[PDB]
Amino acid sequence: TLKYPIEHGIVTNWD
Amino acid sequence: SPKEILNLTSELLQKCSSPAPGPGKEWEEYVQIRTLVEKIRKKQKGLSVTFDGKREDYFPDLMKWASENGASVEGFEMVNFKEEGFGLRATRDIKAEELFLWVPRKLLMTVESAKNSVLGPLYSQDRILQAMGNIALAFHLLCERASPNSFWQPYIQTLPSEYDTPLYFEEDEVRYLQSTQAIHDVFSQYKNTARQYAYFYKVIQTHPHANKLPLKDSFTYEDYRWAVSSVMTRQNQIPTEDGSRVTLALIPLWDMCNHTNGLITTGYNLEDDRCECVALQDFRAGEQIYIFYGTRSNAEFVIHSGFFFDNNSHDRVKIKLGVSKSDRLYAMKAEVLARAGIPTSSVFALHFTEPPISAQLLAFLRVFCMTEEELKEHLLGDSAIDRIFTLGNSEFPVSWDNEVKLWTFLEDRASLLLKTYKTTIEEDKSVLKNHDLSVRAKMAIKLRLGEKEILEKAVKSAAVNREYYRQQMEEKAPLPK
Ligand SMILES: Nc1ncnc2c1ncn2[C@@H]1O[C@H](C[C@@H](N)CC[C@H](N)C(=O)O)[C@@H](O)[C@H]1O
């Protein structure tokens, strides 16, 4: 499969 | 006026640094913070930097800039679509799995590129910039946006000027989300963004490492709202050039692709040091080129990507569960969960696509409803670890009695959660059918409708499972394995 799949707009923590 | 903004931002920093006044007054706090942010925004001049041309006037420069640095620029065109906004449209037939889009690392905006920019000195001093790469990217965008000779100007000038994240909602549009799960994340997003703006506004004025930044002369709330919304709706995780770590990056050109259902077909090529996208499906000439963003929920799509996706097969709602310290079997249950790698209390998920619960939630619910005798069998003896190994497997129940108990509990809990909403499913559908609403209002109402529809389906699926395992118990069927 994809070794480094790229997630468009991956959710990060902003707290 | 400069001293007045200092007083308002200081008041905003203190109000947004206060602890939560309890969930019963979070709406009042939200409106209070909105009032101060809007007062600051009305006294500021919007975005510090605006461009004279239209958004589509700069797309040819994006293509020329990306082509000069080795990116794919043929086979597609930029089109302003009604549903999704601007996106890519094929100008030739593109077959599924064809590598049609690639973007070398030199074009990307990364935390590493932020560290080596004019933001460098301030980055090396501020602990929030060092710990939060997403916020670092936001200021990387702002500093380069206000730099006329920036290498990334062709990308920044083609970015949107506004978004549909909840930061842009009107008060009555957020009000639709009262009594839902999602509104608390909307509250947190607004409070965090307001606190961060006031924090960095004061930091930029007090830190000598920010004297060379254009933000020293102008840094409005509109700037920060646009910057964090640009990042949250478009940022990506990629490996470092070493390949040993992960970092956050904005990927020009490719991030113009809008979302449809499918699988992730975008990956980073470490040997050629570039982001590569293969066609998710066949795209005929004249059809929009879509990608699959990820298996995110509609709550995450609304709050962090600024849109609601009707065909979201990965939608889910949160459910908080934990073993009560008042339980007589608390110690044994917590130990079984510990040996299974499951915390004693956690936030689980209820999915719309069957099965409604994951293996981790199934294992928790099984232990949650175990008898003392069943807990002993998962703690002692040569088969205890084998029993732990199958806790998340639907085909290997602990007992028919344990299944009936856990599905009865889930049915009751999901039905109780449905009673905590201020509107019903039928009322939400009536509002969407009989009222004329903005895009942002529809997002909020569809979101609260989606939460209840997932809970309603979980009630039906748990009731069905309860009847299935009650039949096995009354028929005295042999337990599997
Ligand atoms: N399926 C969709 N339905 C509605 N809006 C979408 C959809 N997919 C993407 N979007 C929008 O596109 C944004 C993500 C962008 N990176 C994609 C290009 C964007 N449409 C633009 O004009 O720059 C999201 O925040 C949405 O506003």
Residue numbers in the entry:
A (entry chain Y): 66 to 80
B (entry chain A): 20 to 500
Which text from the study accompanies this structure?
First, we used the SAM analog sinefungin (adenosyl ornithine) to prepare a complex mimicking the pre-reactive state. Like SAM, sinefungin also carries a formal positive charge, but does not support the methyl transfer, and thus functions as an inhibitor. The target histidine’s imidazole ring is nearly parallel to the aromatic ring of Tyr312, and, to maximize the H-bond potential of both nitrogen atoms, the imidazole ring is positioned such that N3 donates a proton to the main-chain carbonyl oxygen atom of Asp274 (N3–H•••O = C), while the N1 accepts a proton from a water molecule (numbered as w1). This water molecule is coordinated adjacent to the histidine-binding pocket, and is saturated with four H-bonds, three of which are at a traditional H-bond distance from the interacting atoms: the N1 atom of the histidine (2.8 Å), the main-chain carbonyl oxygen atom of Thr252 (2.6 Å) and the side-chain hydroxyl oxygen atom of Ser324 (2.7 Å). The fourth H-bond to w1 is weak and is within a distance of 3.4–3.5 Å from the main-chain carbonyl oxygen of the target histidine, the Cα atom of actin residue G74, or one of the guanidino nitrogen atoms of Arg315. The main difference between the pre-reactive and post-reactive complex structures is that the imidazole ring of methylated His73 rotated away from that of histidine.
Here we elucidate the structural and molecular determinant(s) of target specificity of histidine vs. lysine in the active site of SETD3. On the substrate-binding surface, the residues are diverse, reflecting the fact that the three enzymes act on three very distinct substrates—the large subunit of Rubisco by LSMT, RelA subunit of nuclear factor NFκB by SETD6, and actin by SETD3—with limited sequence similarity immediately surrounding the methylation target. To facilitate the methyl transfer reaction, SETD3 provides a local environment that promotes deprotonation of the target nitrogen N3 of histidine (and concomitant protonation of N1). Most (if not all) SAM-dependent MTases use the classic SN2 reaction mechanism, which requires the target nitrogen be in a deprotonated state.
